[PDB]
């Protein structure tokens, strides 16, 4: 229901609910809840306090909250001031993984303006 | 000073990677950690300290154990 992570988990299932917290996906959720020793198909409903407190112990071992957003912002800022190729691509909203820019660069450029 | 119009101003702890620790009054609200301080700077000391124990150049060294 409520976890130490600011993100509040949805009632349906457990592995999917864990994925709702930003920074934890399927495998980390698979590893965390299997370290909890609980069946994976249980909901947060039909569940007591004695499991989500154990989940708070295990999730806190991974660095997963909006503090992870601070890391990615600081990593992005490392590429900005570095004067690297990735920073000028991050500066102009261009793709940085070497994708083609002549066409099919919408997901970076954004919808075209006239 | 006016009473309520100013921000909170507390004495806290500042910790540097070279280990020098300072008791500084500020508005951070909690203890904070400095990767570089005034003793930790090549310019002031003229010595260019190499203690990057918690650092990135060190990651580059353990990663590739290249010799001189």
């Amino acid at each position: 229901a409520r976890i130490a992570g600011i993100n509040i988990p949805d009632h349906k299932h457990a592995v999917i609910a864990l994925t709702s917290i930003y920074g934890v996906g399927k495998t980390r959720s698979k590893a965390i809840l299997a370290a909890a020793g609980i069946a994976e198909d249980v909901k947060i409903s039909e569940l007591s306090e004695g499991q989500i407190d154990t989940l708070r112990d295990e999730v806190a071992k991974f660095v997963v909250e909006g503090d992870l957003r601070r890391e990615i912002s600081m990593s992005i800022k490392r590429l900005m001031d570095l004067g690297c190729y990735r920073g000028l691509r991050h500066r102009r909203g261009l793709p940085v993984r070497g994708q083609r820019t002549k066409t099919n660069a919408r997901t970076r450029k954004g919808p075209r303006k006239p | 000073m006016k009473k309520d119009i100013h921000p909170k101003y507390e004495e806290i702890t500042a910790s540097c990677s070279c280990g020098n620790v300072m008791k500084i009054r500020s508005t951070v609200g909690h203890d904070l950690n400095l990767d570089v301080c005034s003793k930790c700077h090549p310019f002031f000391t003229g010595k260019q300290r190499d203690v990057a124990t918690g650092g990135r150049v060190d990651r580059f060294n353990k990663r590739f154990n290249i010799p001189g």
């Binding site: 570095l82 004067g83 990735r86 000028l88 | 990135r56 150049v57 590739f64 290249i66």
Partner: protein, 84 residues
């Protein structure tokens, strides 16, 4: 990405002239053509002029620049937009 086991790739000519520089300090911004090499911590000190196709852009190396290649800090395509 270099395979780690092979280790960082450097140009022997660049390594030789940068150690001559690192001993006698900064005399001039030494220029080079090898943009494919990484920058070593020992070379983190001098100013390196990387060739970008026609000129040699001088880029002073910082501590965060270590590990990254030289050619990341030398742009080759001049783009200032489309309507100017």
């Amino acid at each position: 990405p270099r395979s780690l086991k092979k280790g960082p790739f450097i140009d022997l000519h660049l390594l030789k002239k940068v150690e001559k520089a690192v001993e006698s300090g900064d005399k001039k911004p030494l220029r080079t053509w090898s943009r494919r090499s990484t920058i070593f911590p020992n070379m983190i000190g001098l100013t390196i002029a990387v060739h970008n196709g026609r000129q040699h852009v001088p880029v002073f190396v910082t501590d965060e620049m270590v590990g990254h290649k030289l050619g990341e800090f030398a742009p080759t395509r001049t783009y200032r937009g489309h309507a100017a």
